[PDB]
């Protein structure tokens, strides 16, 4: 019973998190097996970020530059290479706690679980999702830098994102585990700005589909869709066009609650058409879209990780 | 910039937890130095939980019939005793990663970070805030009992909650690590039910103050209110009444963004009396009472922990 935005537990990724200091830029690192991941911002300092050459900076820089610091433990810095937008610094010390990680880039719509964390120690965890326009909807103070994303299979670390920056309405940008930005942004101060969002249709059905499992049943109604006409309502609330494979993912709820997929997108028109009339669904007054159909499946299963 | 309801790292408290296993129940267990402590609701089975006498029940069992399980080592249970509605299973094997640690009780109004745990294997992590009727709002399911709630500061975790039951809203009961219930609930199966709630007027003050310092400031008037003229229209909405002592802890948040404590009031005061009017705060469409004044702070300032 309940149903709750749930991070994945982060101890595994505790254990990776470290300090890197070059000149006077401090930020967060990612210490698997001999490598240090980071943002390659830190081999700027107060006058290298208007329009920086990286390259040209990176080469005049000595490892001795770089301080990474592993609790109260200093690794020394045996090598260093740029990949895209990170830094990958060589140290002479495998990290013992290394979990089994991959690195992968997720789609917008699919979720992870960000570790917050100030001068290598960690602040706080919490769920995000990629929005439909590359950003996501954070929360990170100065010093932030290099935090990561993540989800977890098992034993697995699936690493999806490290943050770099936040953008002038307060969201936030950054790069797969490959320095590859999601997303069209850059590195640097520019006037680079979010552009518009939509809702994830999707995810906003799973989670109608949780509040049926969960007790809820107010909003369900007689009627039926076609997938064409719940498409045409959709577009015109800023939602995106859902599709059959969309269709065919949802099959396990439904099939679990045994309400037709299009019976529920029935539902969702008419809350889209007439709001909730002063109701609320799963403790929200707003339609949410931030768990994905596997999310409830897994949450309203048990499912474990070791 | 942004702010979310956001966990404790839950590394330190992965690795306490372990599997606890008698009869035909099993739950989760907390391991610290030598002993595991868990609900001694797993003495019980399929005919000893109606009114059930414990003491008796457990005089009866041998060190022998409890299977406990740390990963995929067995521990050998060499005591056992019964404190409250917690057992203190005595093993041979202290925990080589106990934290630092505290036993506390917390006060309705504060707020925790729960582990989600099943056979002992963590699920996911999210915030709660005890209610004033002693519940609190959780995902839990079948297996679930014996999962630990938490707060941390600097490197000591104060142990806060157990998990033992679901009441039949779908709310959820526990006990302190003492063993004593938070409220008036039992750990059998009677026809108890959770009782009335309030919303919390500190917190929803604190999440406004957080509002304001994120650039949200829509909501704010020229009005300026008594303390006894707000606690009048606040009973009024099923909201606790607010203290003066409510009003310092406020001072902090309010020092920082220049409103006095009453002047926030009267704010809340219009909300509670109109509605958002189809607007939202920090996206939300409800006014939000499960952050406390300290952890807005906390969150707006980077701390952090070791
Ligand atoms: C997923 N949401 C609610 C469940 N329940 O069984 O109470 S499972
Ligand atoms: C998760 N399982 C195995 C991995 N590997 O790199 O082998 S990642
Ligand atoms: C990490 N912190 C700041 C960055 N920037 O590109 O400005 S990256
Ligand atoms: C706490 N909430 C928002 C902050 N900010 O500085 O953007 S601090
Ligand atoms: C947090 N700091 C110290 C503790 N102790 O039991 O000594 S708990
Ligand atoms: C832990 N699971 C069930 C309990 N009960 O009191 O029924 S305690």
Redesign the interface.
């Known amino acids: ?12 990724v ?2 990776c998190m470290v300090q890197v200091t070059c000149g006077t830029t401090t930020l967060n690192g990612l210490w698997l097996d001999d490598v240090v991941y980071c943002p390659r911002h830190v081999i700027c300092t107060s006058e290298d970020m208007l329009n920086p050459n990286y390259e040209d900076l990176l080469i005049r820089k000595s490892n001795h530059n770089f301080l990474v610091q592993a ?1 109260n433990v200093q690794l020394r810095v045996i090598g260093h290479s740029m990949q895209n937008c990170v830094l990958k610094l060589k140290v002479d010390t495998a990290n013992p706690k290394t979990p089994k990680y991959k690195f992968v880039r997720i789609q917008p719509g699919q979720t992870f679980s960000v ?5 290598g ?6 769920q995000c999702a990629m929005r439909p326009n590359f950003t996501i ?8 830098c290099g935090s990561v994303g993540f989800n977890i299979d098992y034993d697995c670390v699936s690493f999806c994102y490290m943050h770099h920056m ?1 953008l002038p309405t ?3 940008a950054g790069t797969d585990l490959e320095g590859n930005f999601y997303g069209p942004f850059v590195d640097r101060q520019t006037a680079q700005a979010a552009g518009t969002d939509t809702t994830i249709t999707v995810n906003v059905l799973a989670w109608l589909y949780a509040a049926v499992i ?2 809820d049943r107010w909003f369900l109604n007689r009627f039926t869709t076609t997938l064409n006409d719940f498409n045409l309502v959709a577009m015109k609330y800023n939602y995106e066009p859902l599709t059959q494979d969309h269709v065919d993912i949802l099959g396990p709820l439904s099939a679990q609650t045994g309400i037709a997929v299009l019976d529920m997108c029935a539902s969702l028109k008419e809350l889209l058409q007439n709001g909730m009339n002063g109701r ?1 669904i799963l ?4 339609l949410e879209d931030e768990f994905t159909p596997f999310d409830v499946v897994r ?8």
């Open positions: 019973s309940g149903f709750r935005k749930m991070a994945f537990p982060s101890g595994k505790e254990g609790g570790l917050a964390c100030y001068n120690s960690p602040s706080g965890v919490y909807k954070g929360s990170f103070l100065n010093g932030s936040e307060g969201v936030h969960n007790g609320t403790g929200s007054a707003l949450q309203c299963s048990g499912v474990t990780f070791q």
